[PDB]
Design a protein around this nucleic acid. Structure first.
Ligand SMILES: [Mg+2]
Length: 113
RNA sequence: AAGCAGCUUUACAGAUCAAUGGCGGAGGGAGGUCAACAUCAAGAACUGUGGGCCUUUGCCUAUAGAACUUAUAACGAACAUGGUUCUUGCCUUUUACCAGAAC
């Protein structure tokens, strides 16, 4: 097994460097989701109970999405829908109409966060 | 529109009393605080049918039919409630509330 690893060379990849630091939250950034279609913005749920939407190219802040009362743990953006799904430690799963930026279609049943 | 002729029918006397041609006829009418199924808010908006293009979709062209609803816009010349979210009001907590919005 060990002579077959030395027989093989890994693919070269280009290294990574920091290009932009964005300071906008009041707590920890706990989750990041990208726009799956057309790639203009990303959204960061956080520890200050609010999700912010950041433009990918310029780095400016587009909007803030409040509506959770505890820390937003994960954020998922849909490719087939204009829907944003967001869970938190406050036992809530929420949907968001991105054509309206309002909470629709709330989900219920998790015993904990 | 009286009257005459032409036309369409009509009670019919017919010609034919055949092959015909026209209209009607080859399982009703009125209803029911009966039922089922469709359908009832959108480029001012529908569908069937023929033709051509591309390769079925879509477009263009020709044609037929469009009930109900709608312009001081809506089936209802009528008018309640609930959910979420935002902003207020009441001010021990909650429910029940206050009264505007958006969905
Ligand atoms: Mg108590």
């Amino acid at each position: 097994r060990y002579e077959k690893l030395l027989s093989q060379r890994p693919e070269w990849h280009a290294p990574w460097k920091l290009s932009r630091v964005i300071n906008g939250h009041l707590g920890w950034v706990r989750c990041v989701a990208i726009d799956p279609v057309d790639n203009e913005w990303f959204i960061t749920g956080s520890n200050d109970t609010t999700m912010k939407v950041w433009d990918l190219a310029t780095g400016k802040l587009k909007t803030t999405l409040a509506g959770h009362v505890m820390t937003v743990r994960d954020v998922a953006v849909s490719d087939r829908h204009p829907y944003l799904f967001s869970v938190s430690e406050d036992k809530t799963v929420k949907c968001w109409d991105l054509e309206k930026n309002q909470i629709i279609r709330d989900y219920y049943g998790h015993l904990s966060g």
